[PDB]
Amino acid sequence: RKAKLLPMEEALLP
Amino acid sequence: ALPPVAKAAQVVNQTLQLDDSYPDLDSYCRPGASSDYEMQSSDSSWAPFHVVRHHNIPDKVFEHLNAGEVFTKLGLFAEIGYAWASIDSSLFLWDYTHPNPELIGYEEATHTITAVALVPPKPGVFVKTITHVLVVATTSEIILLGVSATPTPSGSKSLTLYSTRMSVHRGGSDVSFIVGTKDGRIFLGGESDTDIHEIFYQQEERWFSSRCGKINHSHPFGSRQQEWLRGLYVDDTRNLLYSLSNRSTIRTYHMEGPEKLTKVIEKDKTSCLRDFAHMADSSPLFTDKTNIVALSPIPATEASKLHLMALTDTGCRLFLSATSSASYTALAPQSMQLQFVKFPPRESPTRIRTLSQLDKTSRALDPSALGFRFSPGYFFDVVRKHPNQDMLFVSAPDTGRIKVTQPASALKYFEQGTWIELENGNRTIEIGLTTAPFAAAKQPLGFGNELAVQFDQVPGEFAVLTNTGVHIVRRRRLVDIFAKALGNCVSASDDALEREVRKFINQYGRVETIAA
Numbered sequence: 001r002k003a004k005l006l007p008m009e010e011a012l013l014p
Numbered sequence: 015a016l017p018p019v020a021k022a023a024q025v026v027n028q029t030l031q032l033d034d035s036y037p038d039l040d041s042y043c044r045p046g047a048s049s050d051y052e053m054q055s056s057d058s059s060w061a062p063f064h065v066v067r068h069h070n071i072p073d074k075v076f077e078h079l080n081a082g083e084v085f086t087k088l089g090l091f092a093e094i095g096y097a098w099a100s101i102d103s104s105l106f107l108w109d110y111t112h113p114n115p116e117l118i119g120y121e122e123a124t125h126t127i128t129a130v131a132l133v134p135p136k137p138g139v140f141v142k143t144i145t146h147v148l149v150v151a152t153t154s155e156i157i158l159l160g161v162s163a164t165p166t167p168s169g170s171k172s173l174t175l176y177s178t179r180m181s182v183h184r185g186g187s188d189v190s191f192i193v194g195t196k197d198g199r200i201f202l203g204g205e206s207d208t209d210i211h212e213i214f215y216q217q218e219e220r221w222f223s224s225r226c227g228k229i230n231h232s233h234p235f236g237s238r239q240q241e242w243l244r245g246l247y248v249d250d251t252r253n254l255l256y257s258l259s260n261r262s263t264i265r266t267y268h269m270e271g272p273e274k275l276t277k278v279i280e281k282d283k284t285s286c287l288r289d290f291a292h293m294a295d296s297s298p299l300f301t302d303k304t305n306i307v308a309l310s311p312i313p314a315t316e317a318s319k320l321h322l323m324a325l326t327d328t329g330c331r332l333f334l335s336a337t338s339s340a341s342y343t344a345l346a347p348q349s350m351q352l353q354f355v356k357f358p359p360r361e362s363p364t365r366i367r368t369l370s371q372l373d374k375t376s377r378a379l380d381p382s383a384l385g386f387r388f389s390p391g392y393f394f395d396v397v398r399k400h401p402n403q404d405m406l407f408v409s410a411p412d413t414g415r416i417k418v419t420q421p422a423s424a425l426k427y428f429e430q431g432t433w434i435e436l437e438n439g440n441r442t443i444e445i446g447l448t449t450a451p452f453a454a455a456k457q458p459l460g461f462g463n464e465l466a467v468q469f470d471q472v473p474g475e476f477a478v479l480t481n482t483g484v485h486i487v488r489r490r491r492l493v494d495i496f497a498k499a500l501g502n503c504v505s506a507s508d509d510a511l512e513r514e515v516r517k518f519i520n521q522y523g524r525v526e527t528i529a530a
Contacts, residue, residue: 003118003175011160011176012140012217 033466036417038458039317039391042425043333043354047295049373050428051359052412059498062430063392063408063487066475069110070483074117075099078106084126090484091132092446092477094146094163094171097484100127105150110477110484111170118173125154128204132161133194139217144176149200149213151189156202156213157181158226180215180226187211187230191243196250197272202228203243208259209234210246210267212275231267231275249311249321253344256322262286262306264324266336268346278346279336286324286332289352297374299328299357306332310387315453316461320353323387329358329379329395329407331387356427363405363433379407386445389452390462392474392489393429396442404442406434406478413464414492414522434487440480448475448486465526468493492522496530 160176188204266279336347384396412428
């Protein structure tokens, strides 16, 4: 299963 | 005049100072050489290390690996209990502590993966829940992925990946080595040349600057002969970066700023050999034919002078100091010198139990293919005498003997050693620490006192990655040895215990033995 890559928006602040 | 608890507190304060006076590395690795070992059978209760369990590679990874068209590679993320496997342009991570792991697949990459690493993030860039950055280097580009390795009820980190839009074209230089600093700086090197690159990245997008950049810190030009890297090594406590070349040249770089990297020392094998010749004991185990196969930084918390260990293919551990020209303007060193050599042990591994000068001629560690050192001196050497089976030599400082030795001028690098056999077909790839870095104190004096921390931090454990699985090796404490030895005396005489106890007293002293 290809790993779900959550978005940049959550990753980097602010 | 002085009440009980205040009297006892006086004993505690003086005992704390006694433990914190444990000799520093520089003090028992003084200029000169040593071959001091007490070897233990791996099945003995006195073994300094032993294998506690093993984790096979998942079958699905074997399916992908044997489905490899051109290139495959394995590696370890021992800090979080994960391993990884790359197959051409595809990458697969998995928790090796889990009995039936699921494979975290990442196949966005377009070209062959040549290196993978897990580094700390740059502060003030990512959400706090991002614990690491995953660097994926291909033949075309380097890719950064956010990582969140949050612990689970079972005791194994849960790993989720985040995209970043952060990437840069590789260029003409291969990337086979990636290392990260405490502050999230990412350095790159490979098998094309000796140049060192750094990847920068920032949160904000600008019209004059991208979110992710790459620069060559070596600034090469003109005539250049063939030479490339065998490894990169970081020491945050000194803001240093070391590279090892295929010609056994050791280069030292200093991070004089958050974005600067300056080469400050370059020491080729000839220089090491010249230092070695000026020592009292020269040896045929170290010549112009000898190769240096690995480096291991020694942090400033452990030793002031000795900066670096270098392992030869003959099994010699070369301990090098480094010194600055001045005392004030971090201060960058400008000189490096081979000061002390620990020569190999003589005892070879045997199925059946076999029965004072400097030994500078042993071939027991010849050839040494891979080598690792962990504070306070745990040494792993992959000896490849035969092309099918690796033999693992593992040794530790004889902390008990070092602590009792008197006077200070009699201090030597005493060691306890053992041979751990891996089965036929096991080729060792990498060895990494799974527990927190060892430290009994905050400065060299007292730093290496294993005895003092027996009950404050778990024994060190090390993940040995092979082509068939991950083996867990655990350091054994005095109390572990003492308990095991006594367990063998349960069925014996009153004099059987006294005999075993006298072994401990002769090595550790009476107080340490009775305390155990």
